[PDB]
Amino acid sequence: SSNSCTTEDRREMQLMWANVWSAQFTGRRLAIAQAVFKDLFAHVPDAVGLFDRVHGTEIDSSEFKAHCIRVVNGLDSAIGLLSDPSTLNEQLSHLATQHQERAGVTKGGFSAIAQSFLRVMPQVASCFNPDAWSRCFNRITNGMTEGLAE
Amino acid sequence: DCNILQRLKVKMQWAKAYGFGTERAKFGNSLWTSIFNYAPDARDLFKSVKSEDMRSPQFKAHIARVIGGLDRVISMFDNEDALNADLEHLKSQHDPRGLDALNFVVFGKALFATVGGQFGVCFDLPAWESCYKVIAMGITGNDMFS
Amino acid sequence: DCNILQRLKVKMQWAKAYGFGTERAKFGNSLWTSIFNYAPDARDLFKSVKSEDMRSPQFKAHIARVIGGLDRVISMFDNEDALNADLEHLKSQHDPRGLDALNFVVFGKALFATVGGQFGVCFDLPAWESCYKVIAMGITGNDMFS
Amino acid sequence: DCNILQRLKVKMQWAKAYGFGTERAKFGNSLWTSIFNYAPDARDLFKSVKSEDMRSPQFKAHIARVIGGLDRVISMFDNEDALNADLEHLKSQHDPRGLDALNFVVFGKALFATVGGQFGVCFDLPAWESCYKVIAMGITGNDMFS
Amino acid sequence: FCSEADATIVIKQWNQIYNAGIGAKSRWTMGNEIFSSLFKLKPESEVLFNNVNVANMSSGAFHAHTVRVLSGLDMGINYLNDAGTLTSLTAHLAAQHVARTGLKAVYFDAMGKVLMTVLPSLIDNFNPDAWRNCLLPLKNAIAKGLP
Amino acid sequence: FCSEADATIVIKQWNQIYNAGIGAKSRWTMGNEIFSSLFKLKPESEVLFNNVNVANMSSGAFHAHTVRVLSGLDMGINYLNDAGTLTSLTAHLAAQHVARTGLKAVYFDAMGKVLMTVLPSLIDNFNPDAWRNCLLPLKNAIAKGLP
Amino acid sequence: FCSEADATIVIKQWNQIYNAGIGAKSRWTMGNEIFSSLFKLKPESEVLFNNVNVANMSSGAFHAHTVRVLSGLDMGINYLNDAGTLTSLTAHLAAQHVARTGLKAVYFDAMGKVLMTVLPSLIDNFNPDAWRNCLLPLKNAIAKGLP
Amino acid sequence: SECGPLQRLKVKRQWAEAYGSGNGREEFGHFIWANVFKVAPSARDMFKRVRGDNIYTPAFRAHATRVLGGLDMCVALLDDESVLNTQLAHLASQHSSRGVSAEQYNVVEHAVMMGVEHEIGQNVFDKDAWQACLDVITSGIQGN
Amino acid sequence: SECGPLQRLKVKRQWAEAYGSGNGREEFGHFIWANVFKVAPSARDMFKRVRGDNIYTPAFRAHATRVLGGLDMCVALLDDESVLNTQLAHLASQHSSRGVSAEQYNVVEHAVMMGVEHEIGQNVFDKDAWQACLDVITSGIQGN
Ligand SMILES: *[C@@H]1O[C@H](CO[C@@H]2O[C@@H](C)[C@@H](O)[C@@H](O)[C@@H]2O)[C@@H](O[C@@H]2O[C@H](CO)[C@@H](O[C@H]3O[C@H](CO[C@H]4O[C@H](CO)[C@@H](O)[C@H](O)[C@@H]4O)[C@@H](O)[C@H](O[C@H]4O[C@H](CO)[C@@H](O)[C@H](O)[C@@H]4O)[C@@H]3O)[C@H](O)[C@H]2NC(C)=O)[C@H](O)[C@H]1NC(C)=O
Ligand SMILES: *[C@@H]1O[C@H](CO[C@@H]2O[C@@H](C)[C@@H](O)[C@@H](O)[C@@H]2O)[C@@H](O[C@@H]2O[C@H](CO)[C@@H](O[C@H]3O[C@H](CO[C@H]4O[C@H](CO)[C@@H](O)[C@H](O)[C@@H]4O)[C@@H](O)[C@H](O[C@H]4O[C@H](CO)[C@@H](O)[C@H](O)[C@@H]4O)[C@@H]3O)[C@H](O)[C@H]2NC(C)=O)[C@H](O)[C@H]1NC(C)=O
Ligand SMILES: *[C@@H]1O[C@H](CO[C@@H]2O[C@@H](C)[C@@H](O)[C@@H](O)[C@@H]2O)[C@@H](O[C@@H]2O[C@H](CO)[C@@H](O[C@H]3O[C@H](CO[C@H]4O[C@H](CO)[C@@H](O)[C@H](O)[C@@H]4O)[C@@H](O)[C@H](O[C@H]4O[C@H](CO)[C@@H](O)[C@H](O)[C@@H]4O)[C@@H]3O)[C@H](O)[C@H]2NC(C)=O)[C@H](O)[C@H]1NC(C)=O
Ligand code: HEM
Ligand code: HEM
Ligand code: HEM
Ligand code: HEM
Ligand code: HEM
Ligand code: HEM
Ligand code: HEM
Ligand code: HEM
Ligand code: HEM
Ligand SMILES: [Ca+2]
Ligand SMILES: [Ca+2]
């Protein structure tokens, strides 16, 4: 059909997310991100290099963990703002400039991680709707990669 | 083994969990969402029914045919001759697509979660595991369902 | 199996299914009712807690202790150190009773039926089978749960 | 007639009677139903918009365009410049159709019935008759609406 | 297909005699009465079912056939208020018939009269008009392309 | 077109600044801002309105033009949830722009940017996604075929 | 035991900081604070836990100990309104402490003071009276008989 | 008072209650920043790039979103000193070239406390626990 | 920012929402003047004749009524420069012999904005639009 991220898809995505999201401890978030990156790496070996500053070769180090926590925080911020797109646009631009001009960071890698999330979420999220999720995950990455290389 | 008693318990539990009207479409959508979440890669085997958009008429038609099969198949549990004929009829439709038997294991797991989730705490899982084996074995042949 | 994702999934669903207050005793009464229904003989194994009468306080206390056990174990699913240390503890309590390991297979089935019925259609059966094993193994040592 | 007071009155009542969203299509379906009932022959004048079937999208679009016309006209009731300029526009669209002016008298009656029924007992019929004329005159040029 | 109010009557009337709680036996029992009636109206159509052992209608092969037939009719009825899916469902059903040769449009017209005659004997206060309104289009969609 | 929940938001936000209880003045005030902006974006398109007296945007002829433009937009919006009629409504509107002299599809892309730029100033918590999902489809229909 | 309204408050407050949706980490974090405090009050009692590796309170063995201690407390609390089962539950717990080496009733009096001191830091508007009315009775049951 | 293990648990729960899942987040962040800029109007000059002159704008709302997302990470990590201190170092570097004064940090602290109290009510607000753990947080964002 | 045609429409709608039909007008005006006199207690001396010492009195309530009635006229006329400027001149003469400082005008502006926000919520309050059009209004009441 349209493939656009609809108001109802957004409601559902906030549900898929809010339920799994631990608002008190990093245990859940952390576990979800690390798993996302393991998958990302195993499908894209060359991608681990882009994370040397955050110790991407050591997913359990204090530095990569803190980074996973930041990625999970960026996604959460975007999933929440799906409800208020005016502000969402400003937040997705900021994220965009945070990934822009980074050697190795391209749209290809975002499509990759998109599939990593599609493989991770169902394992941890109950009542996962892969369709609504991907339609809005893509809405979010599109804003994050507006000025990135293919 | 799926003796007669288990077949009856299973027909009774299915009837209750399957329901009437649109409740069936909901049950089906749940069954299939669970299958693709249990094995995200099985989704590719259904390009022919447009599994890219699970809420498309093509896939929804596919969801209805499947639970429709489950229904008629479960309703014949008590008559061996009718049962085996229809299971063969189904195998005939599933062979030319060369399917890995393990997918049918996932399907059964999803079937249990859906029926039990809809039926409640008195869901008889052992009886369901046993009798589902008869359907699986009949459709695939793989003695993994022996 | 039973990676960290499925452990978190199982903790989520257990939390929901298990519930608060008095709904706890209900969930437990159902768990134990399914067990004795799936394997009527296992009932004789609990004469020490008056299994003779499931509504009796002695057997309610037992029910409470067991689901209490399941809950603390599941809560430690993320810390192997405390998990194994506790599974080891639970092991030393069941060993001297010469319990047949096959009854832990029955227990798990009852558990899935009870959690699935109370949680609904999104119950993750594969994750539950895989993570229950870990629990039964830590208590039994039987590679049946491998 | 149709001074500024009656123009404001008519805008008030039209706003209320007309409504928002889907209640718009209902009000329009009623307007057009009364028209064809008051003068069954006028129906043949709209074969170009499939008047043959009032529930058809082609005739719904027409209904929408007409009440949309009534609404924008009524909204400009206070600015003669834009009002006449628009009535002139609507005139150039109806002229080449050789429509009998007497049908605009029928239209107005249907309009009063529809607005009055939906607005209630405080419907101002004299104000409506006087201000409708202005509209029919701008579209027809027939002094019948003088 | 048919209106929401007509569809509702049909669905409710069908659910009376067909649903998950209705055993297979009752099902092939309705099946046999329906195909026997079909064969008597169009004797020539009978041979088309030699692959389901129409020779002995009380056989496992013919029972399963009528069961999937009725299951196919059930599916169609229950989706009367979802024209999008029903359209796709009817297209698929037709594909499974056009695939078989010998079938004629007049055989589906005959099925229509069979149902109109059989159902009132099963259904409480059958409504021939609601059923005609919904079955006709359904039958046409399935037989689309048949000579 | 667009989701039923999206349509609901668009309708709600639009009726905030446009409804039968609003004076025409405000109607054309919004109209002039919309076109002045379209002009500044694509000045080449201004001439197309020389017929409605685009020369003087404070004229009754031009005011009436923006009025009917907005009524059309309103008409389109209020039917977002009636796919059938809206399809027919857009085709008509689409016909009223094809027959017109000097209209390139790119002008409707500019207009889109103008609406996405003007509306947020008039509407409380304007929702660009919901509006994009509902209007883009509409715009393509009213601008499908042209240059 | 304690009133049904008291029990309700205790259950509510307890489920604030302890329930199946809480991570074990926090569980043992509360555990260690509880025992460290019991130690400082009665240091003579620390040795009793040399078996669960009280030497290192960050060990899986000790973490598991506080975990089951808290699950027991939780179990007791959630049954406050089922006098019959709670009586039986406490007797069992009571048996698990009698058979243990070096346990004086006064240690359960200290523990009580620790709970009344630790809990208010974790619980919103902690209610000491309601908690006293419900736990004191429980403590006497789990510490009835010992030195 | 000290930000001990118990205070860190309280803060986590009360922060989760106040911050919530997202519906009341906008109002939550607005209340906070309306408080900061009223107590220290001078400070808005540091927010030129995110429209600090108008906290009602999407740009500022996105910033407020980021900030609270920062506080959330720290609250979530309060019980993991290792990763916590790593995150504080990240925030430190994000504020290094901006000259924030220990005074402005304290301002935001009070603003955060009032907003949380405003969300969960004075009846349960634990001032001691929040001040101690907020000191630990800002103190770390300022290197020390 | 400028008080353009669009900002004038927004202000009109939001003012109509806040001011309403009259039921919440008393509370609306009280909130506003409680704000003014707290930010500028000195100014109440100019209201000796209408009991500025007690804004709870009928006399003051009548004045607050008049003032808001003045703001309403201006908001209503924002899209009619001609009659607008005529009305601003009337208000100008009603304040000419009272020595109001551009500072006090700005005070009342902020008070008005907070009251409107308080009535319709920060979620929709358009600060840019209101400040621009309030500048246009007071600026005109002060001759220029
Ligand atoms: C149409 O189909 C039905 C159903 O038939 C089934 O479906 C078909 C598709 C095929 O797949 C069939 O294989 C399948 O049965 C037909 O009715 C059935 O007809 C059979 C006859 O074969 C009935 O069963 C009779 O035979 C059994 C078994 O006989 C064998 O074993 C005994 C040893 O005990 C040997 O002695 C035989 O030589 C042989 O090897 C037999 O047990 C029954 O007889 C018992 O009862 C009698 C009293 O009535 C006693 O006098 C006997 O001593 C004995 O105790 C049966 O006579 C089978 O029950 C029916 N099915 C049903 C549901 O009634 C139908 O005939 C067919 N149409 C035609 C004409 O082809
Ligand atoms: C674009 O159109 C606009 C709008 O005008 C409309 O559209 C046009 C296409 C025409 O169809 C017009 O008929 C239609 O109204 C044009 O601006 C308007 O232009 C008129 C010019 O007549 C403005 O009217 C001013 O003057 C009139 C009448 O003036 C005569 O009569 C008075 C007696 O009342 C004598 O005292 C004069 O000496 C003169 O002979 C009058 O209503 C107003 O004048 C008074 O009020 C002013 C305050 O507003 C005072 O400052 C004056 O001193 C005086 O007391 C009018 O101001 C009409 O107002 C404007 N519209 C606006 C909103 O300003 C525009 O010019 C045109 N573009 C071009 C270049 O063609
Ligand atoms: C009481 O128990 C605790 C908890 O430990 C647990 O319980 C015990 C009873 C045992 O069963 C343990 O197996 C169980 O985990 C004891 O504190 C823990 O002790 C371990 C000591 O191994 C701490 O681990 C640190 O070191 C490990 C591994 O170090 C080796 O490998 C790394 C490669 O990754 C090499 O680079 C090293 O040279 C070394 O050979 C590692 O995971 C961490 O080290 C990194 O991270 C630090 C930041 O946290 C950096 O500062 C380091 O430079 C390095 O990059 C660990 O820090 C483990 O963390 C603690 N637990 C905590 C929470 O601190 C405790 O000692 C014991 N009491 C006694 C006296 O027995
Ligand atoms: C849509 C999912 C993603 C989200 C929500 C996300 C979010 C974030 C966030 C919040 C940061 C930290 C920014 C800062 O504080 O400075 C970050 C950093 C980064 N991201 Fe992503 N990211 C996503 C996908 C990706 C992908 C697909 C790649 C590329 C392969 C990538 C590469 C990076 C790199 C290289 C950094 C810098 C790490 C560092 O601090 O050294 N990100 N991302
Ligand atoms: C044991 C339970 C199952 C039942 C009762 C069942 C039933 C059905 C039915 C009724 C159809 C439609 C046949 C037709 O009319 O053309 C069908 C089609 C199909 N099934 Fe299954 N099925 C089952 C399991 C599976 C599994 C586990 C897979 C594998 C992942 C599978 C793959 C397919 C495919 C690929 C089609 C063809 C879709 C198309 O293009 O039309 N089925 N099944
Ligand atoms: C994995 C699931 C199981 C868990 C978590 C579990 C847990 C427990 C716990 C916590 C106790 C009480 C220990 C005490 O305080 O003295 C207990 C007792 C007991 N369990 Fe299990 N158990 C499980 C499965 C089983 C099974 C399958 C059997 C055997 C058929 C069994 C037989 C017993 C018996 C006989 C007792 C002693 C009751 C008494 O006090 O007289 N348990 N179990
Ligand atoms: C005063 C009330 C009336 C108003 C406001 C009105 C308005 C309109 C409008 C806006 C259109 C669509 C123009 C377009 O976009 O092409 C239209 C079309 C039309 N109107 Fe009217 N109209 C009125 C009365 C009538 C009456 C009384 C008749 C005749 C019996 C009539 C006959 C038509 C016809 C034949 C069309 C063309 C439909 C087509 O597209 O094929 N109208 N009218
Ligand atoms: C409108 C009512 C009818 C329905 C709902 C219906 C439904 C079905 C269904 C579901 C199948 C099985 C498809 C598969 O799984 O491969 C089938 C097969 C078949 N149908 Fe129909 N059918 C209807 C009428 C007819 C009529 C009127 C004829 C012709 C005289 C007919 C002839 C056949 C034949 C020859 C087969 C193939 C049997 C075989 O596999 O050997 N059907 N029908
Ligand atoms: C999506 C927004 C738009 C809507 C809703 C819209 C609507 C309308 C309507 C209702 C009319 C009057 C039709 C009649 O009664 O004959 C009209 C006329 C016209 N429109 Fe549009 N329009 C839109 C965008 C545009 C754009 C982007 C252009 C291009 C520059 C354009 C150019 C025209 C022209 C040239 C006329 C004829 C004016 C005349 O009568 O001389 N429109 N439009
Ligand atoms: C009212 C609060 C208390 C509760 C709920 C509680 C609960 C428990 C539980 C559930 C166990 C584990 C039993 C088993 O599985 O075998 C346990 C063990 C034990 N408790 Fe307590 N207890 C409490 C207070 C105390 C106090 C005040 C002391 C005294 C110093 C104490 C000393 C012990 C000892 C020595 C063990 C055995 C540890 C081991 O396994 O080596 N308990 N308690
Ligand atoms: C309470 C603890 C605080 C936290 C958790 C915090 C968090 C953050 C975060 C997450 C960012 C966005 C960084 C980026 O993506 O580049 C940020 C930016 C900023 N913060 Fe803070 N902050 C805190 C306190 C303060 C204080 C007290 C001030 C000063 C008055 C301040 C001034 C700034 C400025 C000027 C920016 C840059 C805005 C821009 O992007 O232009 N922050 N802060
Ligand atoms: C925001 C724009 C303002 C509006 C619309 C406004 C409106 C009014 C109105 C309608 C009156 C009643 C005049 C009469 O009937 O005689 C009035 C009186 C007055 N205003 Fe204002 N005013 C505004 C700002 C201010 C400010 C900033 C001050 C000074 C602090 C002020 C001081 C006064 C005083 C002293 C009176 C006379 C009270 C009396 O009758 O004794 N006004 N104003
Ligand atoms: Ca501080
Ligand atoms: Ca000012």
CSV table of N, CA and C in Angstrom, one decimal, chain H residues 26-27 30 38 51 53-54 56-57 61, chain I residues 1 110 114 117 122-123 125-128:
chain,number,residue,atom,x,y,z
H,26,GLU,N,6.6,15.9,27.2
H,26,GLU,CA,6.7,17.2,26.7
H,26,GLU,C,6.4,18.2,27.8
H,27,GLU,N,5.2,18.0,28.4
H,27,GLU,CA,4.8,18.9,29.5
H,27,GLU,C,5.9,18.8,30.6
H,30,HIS,N,8.9,20.9,29.6
H,30,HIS,CA,8.6,22.3,29.5
H,30,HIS,C,8.6,22.9,30.9
H,38,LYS,N,13.6,30.9,34.3
H,38,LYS,CA,13.0,32.0,35.1
H,38,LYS,C,13.9,32.3,36.3
H,51,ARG,N,17.1,27.7,19.9
H,51,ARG,CA,16.0,28.6,20.2
H,51,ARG,C,15.6,28.7,21.6
H,53,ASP,N,15.3,31.2,23.3
H,53,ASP,CA,14.4,32.4,23.4
H,53,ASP,C,12.9,32.0,23.4
H,54,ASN,N,12.7,30.8,22.8
H,54,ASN,CA,11.3,30.3,22.7
H,54,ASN,C,11.3,28.8,22.9
H,56,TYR,N,9.0,27.0,23.3
H,56,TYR,CA,7.7,26.4,22.8
H,56,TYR,C,8.0,25.9,21.3
H,57,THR,N,9.1,26.2,20.8
H,57,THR,CA,9.5,25.8,19.4
H,57,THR,C,9.9,24.3,19.4
H,61,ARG,N,12.1,22.1,21.9
H,61,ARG,CA,11.5,20.9,22.4
H,61,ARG,C,12.4,19.6,22.2
I,1,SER,N,10.5,38.5,15.8
I,1,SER,CA,9.4,38.0,15.0
I,1,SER,C,8.4,39.2,14.7
I,110,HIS,N,3.7,40.2,29.5
I,110,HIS,CA,4.1,38.9,30.0
I,110,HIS,C,2.9,38.3,30.8
I,114,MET,N,1.2,34.6,30.0
I,114,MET,CA,1.1,33.5,31.0
I,114,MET,C,-0.3,33.1,31.2
I,117,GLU,N,-1.6,31.2,28.3
I,117,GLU,CA,-0.9,29.9,28.2
I,117,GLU,C,-1.6,29.0,29.3
I,122,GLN,N,0.6,25.1,27.6
I,122,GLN,CA,1.8,25.4,26.9
I,122,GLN,C,1.9,24.6,25.6
I,123,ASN,N,1.2,23.4,25.6
I,123,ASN,CA,1.3,22.6,24.4
I,123,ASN,C,0.9,23.3,23.1
I,125,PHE,N,0.4,27.1,23.1
I,125,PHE,CA,0.8,28.5,23.2
I,125,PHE,C,1.8,28.9,22.2
I,126,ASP,N,1.5,29.9,21.4
I,126,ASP,CA,2.4,30.4,20.4
I,126,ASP,C,3.0,31.7,20.9
I,127,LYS,N,4.2,31.6,21.6
I,127,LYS,CA,4.8,32.7,22.2
I,127,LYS,C,5.3,33.8,21.1
I,128,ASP,N,5.8,33.3,20.0
I,128,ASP,CA,6.3,34.3,19.0
I,128,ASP,C,5.1,35.2,18.5
